[PDB]
Amino acid sequence: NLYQLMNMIQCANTRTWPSYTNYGCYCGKGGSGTPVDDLDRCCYTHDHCYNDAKNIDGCNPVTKTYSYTCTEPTITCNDSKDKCARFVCDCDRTAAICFAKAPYNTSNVMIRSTNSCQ
Ligand SMILES: CCCCCCC(=O)O
Ligand code: NA
């Protein structure tokens, strides 16, 4: 779920939401070019995770609601029986964690369509 994903990001980092809404070549809707740094690489993978998720019947990562738990900054996926809920939760979980780990370069904030993401 796009909103739950927001919270995993909230639950695992210091950096706010708009902080990722549009950063580098892949953080944000769709992606082009080659990832910029490793934070953008987090977004690249997330993306791909979402594409694979779509390979599950009736599975829309973007709107699927799963069961997860947060205890700043640890987050857990409680889905077992719903294959889509779990695949998507791990997708989002892995991203949040990936984000908290990566450095935040302020010069990559809006290089979109600017030519490096061909
Ligand atoms: C385009 C609005 C979406 C969220 C992008 C979150 C991210 O960097 O994966
Ligand atoms: Na993207």
PDB file of C-alpha atoms and ligand atoms in Angstrom:
ATOM      1  CA  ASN A   1       0.000   0.000   0.000  1.00  0.00           C
ATOM      2  CA  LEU A   2       1.470   3.335  -1.090  1.00  0.00           C
ATOM      3  CA  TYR A   3       0.475   4.964   2.215  1.00  0.00           C
ATOM      4  CA  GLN A   4       1.756   2.105   4.420  1.00  0.00           C
ATOM      5  CA  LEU A   5       4.999   2.332   2.459  1.00  0.00           C
ATOM      6  CA  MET A   6       5.187   5.981   3.500  1.00  0.00           C
ATOM      7  CA  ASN A   7       5.126   4.882   7.121  1.00  0.00           C
ATOM      8  CA  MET A   8       7.803   2.240   6.746  1.00  0.00           C
ATOM      9  CA  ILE A   9       9.948   5.044   5.414  1.00  0.00           C
ATOM     10  CA  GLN A  10       8.811   7.152   8.381  1.00  0.00           C
ATOM     11  CA  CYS A  11       9.398   4.268  10.845  1.00  0.00           C
ATOM     12  CA  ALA A  12      12.990   3.633   9.695  1.00  0.00           C
ATOM     13  CA  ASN A  13      14.646   6.975   8.891  1.00  0.00           C
ATOM     14  CA  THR A  14      15.045  10.644   9.810  1.00  0.00           C
ATOM     15  CA  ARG A  15      14.397  11.888   6.282  1.00  0.00           C
ATOM     16  CA  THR A  16      10.822  12.862   5.518  1.00  0.00           C
ATOM     17  CA  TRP A  17       8.470  11.825   2.673  1.00  0.00           C
ATOM     18  CA  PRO A  18       8.905  14.614   0.008  1.00  0.00           C
ATOM     19  CA  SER A  19      12.541  13.804   0.599  1.00  0.00           C
ATOM     20  CA  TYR A  20      12.058  10.800  -1.652  1.00  0.00           C
ATOM     21  CA  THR A  21       9.073  11.796  -3.778  1.00  0.00           C
ATOM     22  CA  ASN A  22      11.427  12.985  -6.506  1.00  0.00           C
ATOM     23  CA  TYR A  23      15.132  12.227  -6.070  1.00  0.00           C
ATOM     24  CA  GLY A  24      17.668  10.935  -8.557  1.00  0.00           C
ATOM     25  CA  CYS A  25      16.568   8.966 -11.642  1.00  0.00           C
ATOM     26  CA  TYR A  26      14.312   6.337 -10.040  1.00  0.00           C
ATOM     27  CA  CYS A  27      12.912   7.589  -6.749  1.00  0.00           C
ATOM     28  CA  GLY A  28       9.414   8.600  -7.760  1.00  0.00           C
ATOM     29  CA  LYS A  29       6.968   7.299 -10.390  1.00  0.00           C
ATOM     30  CA  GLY A  30       8.704   5.222 -13.066  1.00  0.00           C
ATOM     31  CA  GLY A  31      12.401   5.432 -13.800  1.00  0.00           C
ATOM     32  CA  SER A  32      14.799   6.223 -16.609  1.00  0.00           C
ATOM     33  CA  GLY A  33      18.532   6.178 -17.233  1.00  0.00           C
ATOM     34  CA  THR A  34      21.060   4.620 -14.882  1.00  0.00           C
ATOM     35  CA  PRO A  35      20.635   4.937 -11.084  1.00  0.00           C
ATOM     36  CA  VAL A  36      22.577   7.939  -9.676  1.00  0.00           C
ATOM     37  CA  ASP A  37      23.924   6.784  -6.317  1.00  0.00           C
ATOM     38  CA  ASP A  38      22.935   4.009  -3.980  1.00  0.00           C
ATOM     39  CA  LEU A  39      19.803   5.681  -2.700  1.00  0.00           C
ATOM     40  CA  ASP A  40      18.570   5.851  -6.272  1.00  0.00           C
ATOM     41  CA  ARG A  41      19.589   2.182  -6.524  1.00  0.00           C
ATOM     42  CA  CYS A  42      17.192   1.560  -3.675  1.00  0.00           C
ATOM     43  CA  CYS A  43      14.456   3.061  -5.807  1.00  0.00           C
ATOM     44  CA  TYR A  44      15.520   1.069  -8.870  1.00  0.00           C
ATOM     45  CA  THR A  45      15.153  -2.237  -7.076  1.00  0.00           C
ATOM     46  CA  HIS A  46      11.940  -1.213  -5.333  1.00  0.00           C
ATOM     47  CA  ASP A  47      10.528  -0.538  -8.786  1.00  0.00           C
ATOM     48  CA  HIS A  48      11.530  -3.947 -10.099  1.00  0.00           C
ATOM     49  CA  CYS A  49      10.166  -5.571  -6.970  1.00  0.00           C
ATOM     50  CA  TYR A  50       6.826  -3.938  -7.802  1.00  0.00           C
ATOM     51  CA  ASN A  51       6.943  -5.214 -11.368  1.00  0.00           C
ATOM     52  CA  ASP A  52       7.432  -8.795 -10.166  1.00  0.00           C
ATOM     53  CA  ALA A  53       4.667  -8.377  -7.596  1.00  0.00           C
ATOM     54  CA  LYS A  54       2.336  -7.613 -10.450  1.00  0.00           C
ATOM     55  CA  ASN A  55       2.987 -11.217 -11.551  1.00  0.00           C
ATOM     56  CA  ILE A  56       0.736 -12.450  -8.794  1.00  0.00           C
ATOM     57  CA  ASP A  57      -2.945 -12.819  -9.589  1.00  0.00           C
ATOM     58  CA  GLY A  58      -4.979  -9.833  -8.393  1.00  0.00           C
ATOM     59  CA  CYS A  59      -1.842  -8.134  -7.167  1.00  0.00           C
ATOM     60  CA  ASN A  60      -1.459  -4.359  -7.341  1.00  0.00           C
ATOM     61  CA  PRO A  61       1.467  -3.383  -5.110  1.00  0.00           C
ATOM     62  CA  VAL A  62       0.366   0.228  -5.303  1.00  0.00           C
ATOM     63  CA  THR A  63      -2.990  -0.430  -3.652  1.00  0.00           C
ATOM     64  CA  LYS A  64      -2.591  -3.775  -1.882  1.00  0.00           C
ATOM     65  CA  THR A  65      -3.032  -3.564   1.865  1.00  0.00           C
ATOM     66  CA  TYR A  66      -0.871  -5.876   3.960  1.00  0.00           C
ATOM     67  CA  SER A  67      -0.307  -6.524   7.668  1.00  0.00           C
ATOM     68  CA  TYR A  68       2.893  -5.051   9.062  1.00  0.00           C
ATOM     69  CA  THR A  69       4.237  -3.814  12.374  1.00  0.00           C
ATOM     70  CA  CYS A  70       6.465  -0.923  13.349  1.00  0.00           C
ATOM     71  CA  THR A  71       8.554  -0.271  16.434  1.00  0.00           C
ATOM     72  CA  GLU A  72      10.893   2.601  15.561  1.00  0.00           C
ATOM     73  CA  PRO A  73      12.960   1.712  13.598  1.00  0.00           C
ATOM     74  CA  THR A  74      12.293  -2.001  13.321  1.00  0.00           C
ATOM     75  CA  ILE A  75       9.471  -3.079  10.988  1.00  0.00           C
ATOM     76  CA  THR A  76       7.897  -6.517  10.473  1.00  0.00           C
ATOM     77  CA  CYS A  77       5.693  -8.233   7.856  1.00  0.00           C
ATOM     78  CA  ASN A  78       3.026 -10.432   9.422  1.00  0.00           C
ATOM     79  CA  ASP A  79       1.583 -11.772   6.141  1.00  0.00           C
ATOM     80  CA  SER A  80       1.808 -15.513   5.652  1.00  0.00           C
ATOM     81  CA  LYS A  81      -1.212 -16.817   3.735  1.00  0.00           C
ATOM     82  CA  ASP A  82      -1.581 -13.933   1.246  1.00  0.00           C
ATOM     83  CA  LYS A  83       1.310 -14.272  -1.255  1.00  0.00           C
ATOM     84  CA  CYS A  84       0.718 -10.817  -2.685  1.00  0.00           C
ATOM     85  CA  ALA A  85       0.467  -9.079   0.683  1.00  0.00           C
ATOM     86  CA  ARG A  86       3.798 -10.570   1.729  1.00  0.00           C
ATOM     87  CA  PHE A  87       5.720 -10.067  -1.529  1.00  0.00           C
ATOM     88  CA  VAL A  88       4.659  -6.405  -1.524  1.00  0.00           C
ATOM     89  CA  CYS A  89       5.361  -5.853   2.179  1.00  0.00           C
ATOM     90  CA  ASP A  90       8.885  -7.194   1.791  1.00  0.00           C
ATOM     91  CA  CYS A  91       9.216  -4.987  -1.283  1.00  0.00           C
ATOM     92  CA  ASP A  92       8.344  -1.922   0.775  1.00  0.00           C
ATOM     93  CA  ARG A  93      10.230  -3.100   3.850  1.00  0.00           C
ATOM     94  CA  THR A  94      13.440  -3.667   1.936  1.00  0.00           C
ATOM     95  CA  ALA A  95      13.106  -0.200   0.452  1.00  0.00           C
ATOM     96  CA  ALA A  96      12.624   1.638   3.801  1.00  0.00           C
ATOM     97  CA  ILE A  97      15.642  -0.103   5.235  1.00  0.00           C
ATOM     98  CA  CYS A  98      17.619   0.562   2.034  1.00  0.00           C
ATOM     99  CA  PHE A  99      16.761   4.234   2.322  1.00  0.00           C
ATOM    100  CA  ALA A 100      17.759   4.626   5.946  1.00  0.00           C
ATOM    101  CA  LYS A 101      21.096   3.050   5.079  1.00  0.00           C
ATOM    102  CA  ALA A 102      21.963   5.156   2.033  1.00  0.00           C
ATOM    103  CA  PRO A 103      23.467   8.671   2.150  1.00  0.00           C
ATOM    104  CA  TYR A 104      21.391  11.601   0.966  1.00  0.00           C
ATOM    105  CA  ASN A 105      23.062  13.741  -1.657  1.00  0.00           C
ATOM    106  CA  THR A 106      21.303  17.053  -2.034  1.00  0.00           C
ATOM    107  CA  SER A 107      22.536  17.619  -5.577  1.00  0.00           C
ATOM    108  CA  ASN A 108      20.578  14.643  -6.865  1.00  0.00           C
ATOM    109  CA  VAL A 109      17.311  16.020  -5.537  1.00  0.00           C
ATOM    110  CA  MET A 110      15.927  16.914  -8.962  1.00  0.00           C
ATOM    111  CA  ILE A 111      18.164  15.753 -11.823  1.00  0.00           C
ATOM    112  CA  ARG A 112      15.087  14.157 -13.437  1.00  0.00           C
ATOM    113  CA  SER A 113      14.531  14.752 -17.156  1.00  0.00           C
ATOM    114  CA  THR A 114      17.615  16.892 -16.823  1.00  0.00           C
ATOM    115  CA  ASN A 115      19.667  14.609 -19.148  1.00  0.00           C
ATOM    116  CA  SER A 116      21.542  12.091 -17.032  1.00  0.00           C
ATOM    117  CA  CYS A 117      18.493   9.770 -16.929  1.00  0.00           C
ATOM    118  CA  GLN A 118      18.404   9.053 -20.681  1.00  0.00           C
TER     119      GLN A 118
HETATM  120  C1  LIG B   1       5.634   8.940  -7.456  1.00  0.00           C
HETATM  121  C2  LIG B   1       5.111   8.878  -6.037  1.00  0.00           C
HETATM  122  C3  LIG B   1       5.817   7.739  -5.334  1.00  0.00           C
HETATM  123  C4  LIG B   1       6.809   7.110  -4.386  1.00  0.00           C
HETATM  124  C5  LIG B   1       8.248   6.809  -4.692  1.00  0.00           C
HETATM  125  C6  LIG B   1       8.854   6.169  -3.461  1.00  0.00           C
HETATM  126  C7  LIG B   1      10.232   5.807  -3.919  1.00  0.00           C
HETATM  127  O1  LIG B   1      11.394   6.488  -4.137  1.00  0.00           O
HETATM  128  O2  LIG B   1      10.145   4.432  -4.193  1.00  0.00           O
HETATM  129 NA    NA B   2      10.472   4.690 -10.248  1.00  0.00          NA
END
